[PDB]
Amino acid sequence: QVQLKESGPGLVAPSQSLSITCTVSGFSLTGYGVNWVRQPPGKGLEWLGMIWGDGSTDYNSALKSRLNISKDKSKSQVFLRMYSLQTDDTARYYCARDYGPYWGQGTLVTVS
């Protein structure tokens, strides 16, 4: 059994930034990809980025500048980061394992 888990920070203020952590488990972080998908409250799913099992990471073009996916192999965590927080960023954020899929609970992130 696989298991991912979105351990992020409660609300967040406009202008300030956020940071979320994916604690994967049940497998090696170099053997697959991990994506950060996010869904605005009452809205479509949206990809923000991915981080190859090798370390390469691609980014949703329009959200290039604010992100940063990365991961600590030993800690078994994958980390994601936006900057310049605004209202339309209040969404639930999830990390998905490649080759599955295998989704994470998510974790609502508000923005006040």
Added chain:
Amino acid sequence: QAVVTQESALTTSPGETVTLTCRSSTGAVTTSNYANWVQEKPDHLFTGLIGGTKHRTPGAPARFSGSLIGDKAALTITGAQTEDEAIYFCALWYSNHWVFGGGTKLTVL
């Protein structure tokens, strides 16, 4: 830019065979686009159904099956249940990103 299309919603009934279909704006969906199929349950529960255009995710029930049909991909349920009532999502790998469809609302009556 690449827009993915799914049927907004579809109605069925128990024991029936249903087909949801993820298409592309650029052109025919292929094996290159690695079609992913995810089910959204209430309280926001995503569960992987179909992987690699057609690989049953090690968990999805045998009644879920993926494949390409024409210039598009498709998820079919063969003998649907009440509990299959949810919104299904599909993503399309366009080489370096992932594009999500708008979801299909499937009412099981």
